[PDB]
């Protein structure tokens, strides 16, 4: 199998949890760009963009915290 660490797993949990958001958020934009004045399009896009935002934030902060828990242990080997 391909080589992947523990941080890679913790990260990929999110990618496999959000099944298709990465594509939907793109297609929504592609449609909106065609006719910015449609309110239904605007309304949809707002919610999609907001969800993508929160997804990336949580994904990054968690990886950071597990990096610190590891480094603290490694330091004590000596």
């Amino acid at each position: 199998t391909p080589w992947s660490g523990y941080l890679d797993d913790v990260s990929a949990k999110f990618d496999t949890g959000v099944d298709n958001l990465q594509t939907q958020v793109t297609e929504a934009l592609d449609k909106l760009a065609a006719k910015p004045s449609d309110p239904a399009l605007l309304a949809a896009y707002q919610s999609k963009l907001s969800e993508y935002n929160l997804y990336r934030n949580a994904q990054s902060n968690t990886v950071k915290v597990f990096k610190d828990i590891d480094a603290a242990i490694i330091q004590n080997f000596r």
Binding site: T1, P2, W3
Partner: protein
């Protein structure tokens, strides 16, 4: 006679002792049915590797 023989022989023996006789050789071998190096495949998103 005996003394000369024994002396000469024992000196000859230690003189020739620097002769080195063990030697290494290189053999080249082509594979016909498989890739020689460690082999990577890429799955949809991931490389994986075989010895």
């Amino acid at each position: 006679y005996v003394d000369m023989v024994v002396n000469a022989a024992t000196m000859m023996d230690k003189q020739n002792d620097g002769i080195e006789l063990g030697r290494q050789k290189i053999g080249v071998m082509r594979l016909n049915n498989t890739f020689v190096g460690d082999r990577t495949y890429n799955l949809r998103d991931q490389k994986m590797v075989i010895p």
